[PDB]
């Protein structure tokens with residue numbers, strides 16, 4: 001997901017502005033749905049929500065717009081159990097042997113004969129939660145096992161939290177409401193208001209460990225592999241309690257990253273660190289936020305946001321609609337030099353031409369150079385020390401950069417990586433004259449619709465995720481609900497789309513209508529006021545009631 | 549008195565729901581979403597109830613690409629009656645009313661649906677829903693940033709035998 005909030009110091013109108021670009025599945029339980037909710041006098045919010053939820057998850061009101069991105073904070077901890085040497089179904093806490101609780105669940109299973117048979121399954125549980133096994137990594141032997149404690153299991157506040165957000169007036173009010181309830185499960189919150197405040201919040205439900213406990217309670221090997229693993233044989237490694245927290249064992253709001261500014265804030269699924277590099281966020285628990293090198297999407301955004309020039313709504317919109325593959329900025333120049341140093345290698349001929357013709361984008365008309373670039377980058381990432389300028393923590397926005405072609409070993413592997421990537425591409429059934437849009441589609445009934453965008457790992461702000469199905473790439477997730485909000489005097493001007501349309505049902509008139517528009521990248525008005533809604537020639541109305 | 553909603557649709561089928569309370573508001577949301585996505589919600593509720601194997605057998609998968617039986621085991625464990633009751637008791641009156649309204653609105657569409665925008669009419673899993681079902685979906689959403697990512701790992705967790 002991407003999110004950009006712009007304040008009074010940077011916006012062309014001196015007012016707030018927000019671009020909401022979450023990246024979510026195009027099917028299933030997390031498929032966004034547009035709606036506008038009003039209880040006259042005390043509620044008026046519009047945006048998108050998830051199936052089953054009677055609140056708006058991402059949206060805007062009279063003076064406020066907000067959105068979310070998935071954070072990098074941990075919302076659970078693994079616990080390595082020290083098993084009783086006499087009994088692998090018992091585990092030790094403070095040297096004392098405790099029994100595992102066993103909960104059996106019964107499942108009805110339909111056979112081909114259509115008969116229902118009953119399957120019983122035992123779920124083993126510790127004081128921390130259920131046991132989990134990753135064969136070859138997290139095993140359950142006679143020495144150790146692993147349990148998982150999910151913080152959001154006790155989060156009964158999630159619905160009230162979004163309902164409260166739906167009622168928020170401005171950025172300050174939104175912040176109060178979110179910090180007071182701590183009901184946001186696992187996302188960042190970014191917002192902007194008419195007054196021109198831009199807010200970033202890493203305010204979610206995060207397991208709390210007092211700072212002095214961390215170096216003793218962590219499992220070094222596992223945390224180095226990105227797992228929030230703790231020592232489960234020590235009672236002192238239980239989540240710390242702070243009466244200020246809305247929930248026992250979670251991190252108090254005062255200790256979570258917040259940035260309130262009037263220039264801008266952004267997030268593309270990296271930590272809170274470089275939300276705005278002018279004011280870096282540091283000094284948090286590793287469970288909360290770390291100073292990791294940012295992904296190409298954030299790096300792209302910051303390259304468009306840094307500076308003194310006023311930001312327009314059009315500028316933010318085109319950050320999405322341009323479909324620029326930003327990772328090509330770091331490697332393609334030197335890759336083309338390589339292609340020039342190796343003319344008449346024959347094996348490299350098709351690839352070097354395609355890469356040279358390529359518009360460095362993931363548009364419908366983008367050439368096969370994108371495909372070659374993708375396969376190459378998948379191999380280039382597996383090479384060791386091939387960046388000319390490796391990551392410099394003093395230059396986190398401009399590094400890494402370039403291919404170290406002045407080192408003969410590197411030049412050897414990069415050319416091999418290219419020849420391999422080329423080989424894979426020629427092998428596949430890709431016709432000549434094939435553009436990216438001919439490849440990436442979304443199926444609607446018996447037809448296809450070409451979809452612009454590419455994988456976010458390649459620095460495409462308009463992130464689109466697809467898998468190979470038959471002759472094509474079928475979109476499964478990515479850019480979904482788009483919302484760009486400004487605050488002119490009349491009221492909120494909201495602009496965007498729901499990329500995959502309102503209905504998942506092929507029989508509906510709204511099964512592919514917005515999808516056709518997304519293909520053409522033609523965003524639309526999101527009507528909010530009574531006058532905007534009345535001005536719609538497609539306006540329909542129905543009043544329903546029934547006895548309670 | 550008691551469940552009532554005014555609904556306006558603009559271009560592309562975007563619903564605009566007006567009501568005097570949370571109950572009426574939920575009523576409109578449930579009806580409108582059902583008109584667009586009744587089959588989707590029905591399938592996902594089956595998943596959250598851990599009944600995929602019951603309706604579809606063990607060879608199939610959920611929309612999250614989990615085998616039906618492991619998925620059913622996970623969600624049966626996750627959404628036990630005791631868990632759902634505690635969650636419900638912890639809800640504010642406003643939220644309870646939203647959910648009650650949603651369920652009633654969704655169910656009203658089901659009763660009157662003639663297949664115009666619903667491809668799964670007649671299917672046994674397409675049925676009236678309850679507030680508990682919405683709680684099951686909410687909890688499923690909650691654990692997506694945690695134990696939900698370890699659904700397969702939870703199902704696979706078994707004590708060692710007499711090996712080596």
Ligand SMILES: *[B-](O)(O)CCCCCC
Pocket residue numbers: 001002022023024057058068069070071187269
């Ligand atoms: B994005 O890929 O971080 C997903 C964000 C979804 C926000 C849900 C409210």
